[PDB]
Every structure is written in C-alpha cells, then in structure tokens.
Design a protein around this ligand. Structure first.
Ligand SMILES: *[C@@H]1O[C@H](CO)[C@@H](O[C@@H]2O[C@H](CO)[C@@H](O)[C@H](O)[C@H]2NC(C)=O)[C@H](O)[C@H]1NC(C)=O
Ligand SMILES: *[C@@H]1O[C@H](CO)[C@@H](O[C@@H]2O[C@H](CO)[C@@H](O)[C@H](O)[C@H]2NC(C)=O)[C@H](O)[C@H]1NC(C)=O
Ligand SMILES: *[C@@H]1O[C@H](CO)[C@@H](O[C@@H]2O[C@H](CO)[C@@H](O)[C@H](O)[C@H]2NC(C)=O)[C@H](O)[C@H]1NC(C)=O
Ligand SMILES: *[C@@H]1O[C@H](CO)[C@@H](O[C@@H]2O[C@H](CO)[C@@H](O)[C@H](O)[C@H]2NC(C)=O)[C@H](O)[C@H]1NC(C)=O
Ligand SMILES: *[C@@H]1O[C@H](CO)[C@@H](O)[C@H](O)[C@H]1NC(C)=O
Lengths: 49, 50, 88, 50, 99, 49
C-alpha cells in the first residue's frame, strides 16, 4: 500500500550506499587508498595517482 | 496475454435511461510523496579524507 | 553495440482497445461510467445534459438537434482532412 | 590513518587482523606486539552553520 | 482528481515523507431501467425538466433528479415551456399537473 | 575484450547505476501508458446499431 514513500526512501538510501561504495574504486590507479599512494610513490607519480 | 478488463456491454437504446436508486459512500486512499531526505556531503572529506 | 529496445508492455492493439472502451463508455453512458457503473442514456439527452453544463438550456439542443449533429459530423470530417493534409 | 582508537567488542577470529566497512576503508585493526584488537573511529566532524 | 466517484470531501493524514488523502466519494448503485423522453407534450406545448429527467416505469411519467431515483409528478413548477410539440424529436404525450 | 572487462571491474558499480536508471525509465514508460489509457476496468462495446 505504502510503496511510493518506501520507494523514495529506498532510492535515497541506495544512492548514499552507492556513493559510499564508490570510494572502493581504483579509477585506473594502483590503489584506492590515498595513504598507500603517499607511502609508496614519489610526488611526480603519486600526484598523478 | 493479459486481460485488459472484464467485458461489459452497455444496453444503449434511443429511449431508455438508467437511474440509480441507491448509493455507496466510498473512501479511497491516495498516497503522495512530499519531501525527501535532506542530505549534505562534505566534498573535501569525501574526496580526500584526512 | 549493446543497445536493446524493450517492447512496450501494452501493444498498439490493446491501447486501441482501451480507447475503444473509453469511446463506448462516453458515447453510451456519458460521464456515468467514469464515476461508477455505466448508466445508459440516449445521446441526444447526454448532449442536452452537456449543454446544461455550459449554461445553455436543454430546449436549445432539442430544437436544433439536426443542425448540431450536422455541425459535429462536419467538424469530425474536417479534423480527419486537417490531420491528413498537415505534415506538422 | 587518522582516528580515535577505542576498545572493541568484535569477536575477531585468530587469522583475522583488520576489518573493512562497506567503503573498504579500514575500521578496526590488530596491533602488533600486543595482538589486541583496536576499533578505529574517525575523529569528530560536522558542518558549521552561521 | 479526488477519488473514484463523485467527490464529496477529503481528509489529510500525515505519513513519513508524504501525505495520504482519504477521499470520501459518492458512488451510484442499484441502477434501474426506465423509459425516457426528451420532452412532454401538453396542450400543444413542449415541457422540459428544469433540473431533472423524464422517466417512465411503464405506464406513468415522472420527473426525477439525474443522480438518484426520486420520481415526482410532472408539474409546471419543475418543468419549463419552450415552443410547441412539432420540433422536438421523440416528444411523448402526457399530462402536466397545475398546482 | 576480456582484458578491457577486467580493467572495467576496477571502476565499481557504475554499470549497475546505469542499468538501474534505464530500468527505472523503462518501467516508468509502461506506468505512464497505464495511467493514461487504463482508466477503466470494464471493456465497453458499442451497440451493433
Ligand atoms: C436494462 O435492460 C437491458 C435490456 O433490456 C439489460 O441488458 C441486458 O442485461 C443482461 C444481464 O446483464 C444481459 O445478459 C443482456 O445481454 C443485456 N441486453 C442488452 C441488450 O444489453 C440491462 O441489464 C437492464 N438494466 C438493468 C439495470 O437491469
Ligand atoms: C441502499 O443500500 C443500503 C446498503 O448500502 C441498504 O441498507 C441495508 O438494508 C438492509 C435491509 O433494508 C439491511 O439488512 C442492511 O444491514 C443495510 N445495510 C446498511 C449498510 O445499512 C438500503 O436498504 C438500500 N436502500 C434501498 C432503498 O434499496
Ligand atoms: C408506476 O408508478 C406509479 C406510482 O408509483 C404506479 O401507480 C400506482 O400504483 C399502485 C400499485 O399498483 C396503486 O396502488 C396506485 O393507486 C397507483 N397510483 C396512481 C396515481 O395511479 C404505477 O402502477 C407504476 N407502474 C408500473 C408499471 O409499475
Ligand atoms: C400526441 O397528441 C397530438 C395531438 O393530440 C397527436 O397529433 C395528432 O395525431 C393524429 C394522428 O397522427 C393526427 O390525425 C392529428 O392531425 C394530430 N394533431 C396535431 C395537432 O398534430 C399526436 O399524434 C400524439 N402523439 C402520440 C405519440 O400519441
Ligand atoms: C428509436 O428507434 C426506433 C427504431 O430503432 C424508432 O422506431 C423510434 O422512433 C426511435 N425513437 C427516437 C426518439 O428516436
């Protein structure tokens, strides 16, 4: 009966969960963790990553 | 193949009318979303953290 | 290249059937079918009710029924010609 | 990482060292030398409205 | 717009992130067939209903409101005269009572 | 290309978001047609005359 309101709540929660999940994406870099990038590379290539 | 509806043939003629003799008080529900969750994102913390 | 077009759930035949049902309801029953059970009414009495809705007395419709029917038929024919004759 | 290290009640298995949240950032860690499990909570933050 | 049927009134109810409208509507029911005419011919004059419709249960003619069956005697109070009986298609002959 | 798909997996749930948005649009079109045309539950027919 109350599918419309629950649907709106689901879309908002799902969008937030996807946005949080996207931090786990390398995006074509060696790692998804910034601290690792500093701890492992020189600034000329770390800047690129 | 899904049915559109039950088939009803209206008894149309040029000199006959159908008049209601009774009534039903029907209460129906309409659910409408009004607002969403208000979300704020810290751009610097999300992209870079600490 | 990965693109698919999904068919509509309602086919053109069923949409046409729905329009046919709506036309049959509005012709044989007036506005009664939209508010409840379809109650039959003669079409010259339905048109008189509609004339009363816009503030014209029933006698005006009944006395001039043939002229109004001719005007309506002419207008419907003009609509078909206008749609057939205009690209835009 | 930058965070507050607190006591935890999560029953880590013997092989398990650290923990990851939905985002995959580390949320708990097992310290060397002492083998204890420390929960990592990000430091206090929020929006300032004037 | 405000429920299925002829709308009477509506009630608002709060809901999480939303509103629920309870639409109270009037639905006609228990319809009955009647023989109808556009006008009543009396004394060489055509009588039309002021607010209702002419109905017949088989032998007698009455005027009733369109949305509920309440037959009343055809009088000059609830009918109006426009023209003679020669123009209206389907006019029937019946007496019109005078108060 | 299998290697391209393997590199595409590094980007996360972008593909899922695109598919879900298109699925929402696709069901929305059917819902729109249903709202416009399916306003009667009785299929009426005209008399033969
Ligand atoms: C008014 O009369 C008509 C016919 O005189 C009735 O229509 C018939 O209804 C039955 C039962 O639903 C059907 O089996 C017939 O096929 C219908 N005939 C036609 C010509 O449509 C109608 O039901 C009557 N109305 C009421 C309210 O009783
Ligand atoms: C109009 O319909 C109502 C029901 O909606 C009828 O009321 C019922 O009447 C019977 C006997 O008269 C009772 O046993 C029921 O309990 C009544 N129902 C309710 C909800 O009150 C009413 O009689 C009908 N009127 C006419 C003139 O037919
Ligand atoms: C149509 O309705 C009228 C009025 O309700 C009926 O006339 C009455 O019928 C009852 C029962 O037969 C008599 O006791 C009354 O004396 C009648 N009144 C008058 C003024 O004549 C009429 O019988 C109904 N016709 C049908 C076919 O049902
Ligand atoms: C209604 O009444 C009128 C007048 O009483 C009828 O008109 C007459 O009909 C007869 C037979 O058709 C003719 O010979 C007369 O010349 C008509 N007179 C007038 C003034 O037109 C009419 O036929 C009646 N209609 C019904 C259905 O009974
Ligand atoms: C209704 O139709 C019948 C035949 O179909 C005809 O004899 C009668 O005169 C018509 N009545 C009206 C008012 O059109």
């Amino acid at each position: 009966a109350l599918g419309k309101l629950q649907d709106v709540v689901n879309h908002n929660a799902q969008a937030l969960n996807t946005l949080v999940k996207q931090l786990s994406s390398k995006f074509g870099a060696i790692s998804s963790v910034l601290n690792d990038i500093f701890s492992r590379l020189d600034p000329p290539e770390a800047e690129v990553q | 193949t899904m049915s559109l509806g039950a088939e009803n043939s209206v008894a149309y003629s040029n000199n006959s009318i159908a008049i209601p003799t009774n009534f039903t008080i029907s209460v129906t529900t309409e659910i409408l979303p009004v607002s969403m969750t208000k979300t704020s994102v810290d751009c610097t913390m999300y992209i870079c953290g600490d | 290249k990965g693109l698919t077009v999904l068919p509509p759930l309602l086919t053109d035949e069923m949409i046409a059937q729905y329009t046919s049902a709506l036309l049959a309801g509005t012709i044989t029953s007036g506005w009664t079918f939209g508010a409840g059970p379809a109650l039959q009414i003669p079409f010259p009495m339905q048109m008189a009710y509609r004339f009363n809705g816009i503030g014209v007395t029933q006698n005006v419709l009944y006395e001039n029924q043939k002229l109004i029917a001719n005007q309506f038929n002419s207008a419907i024919g003009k609509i078909q010609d206008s749609l057939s004759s205009t690209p835009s | 990482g930058t965070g507050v290290l607190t006591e935890s009640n999560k029953k880590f298995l013997p092989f398990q060292q650290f923990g990851r949240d939905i985002a995959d950032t580390t949320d708990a860690v097992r310290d060397p030398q002492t083998l204890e499990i420390l929960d990592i909570t990000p430091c206090s933050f929020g929006g300032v409205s004037v | 717009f405000c429920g299925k049927g002829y709308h009477l009134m509506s009630f608002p109810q709060s809901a999480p992130h939303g509103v629920v409208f309870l639409h109270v509507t009037y639905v006609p029911a228990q319809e009955k067939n009647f023989t109808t005419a556009p006008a009543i011919c009396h004394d060489g004059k055509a009588h039309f209903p002021r607010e209702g419709v002419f109905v017949s249960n088989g032998t007698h003619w009455f005027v009733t409101q369109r949305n509920f069956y309440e037959p009343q005697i055809i009088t000059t109070d609830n009918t109006f005269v426009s023209g003679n009986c020669d123009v209206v298609i389907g006019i029937v002959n019946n007496t019109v009572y005078d108060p | 290309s299998t290697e391209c798909s393997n590199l595409l997996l590094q980007y996360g749930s972008f593909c899922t978001q695109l598919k879900r948005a298109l699925t929402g649009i696709a069901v929305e079109q059917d819902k729109n047609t249903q709202e416009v045309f399916a306003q009667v539950k009785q299929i009426y027919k005209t008399p033969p005359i």
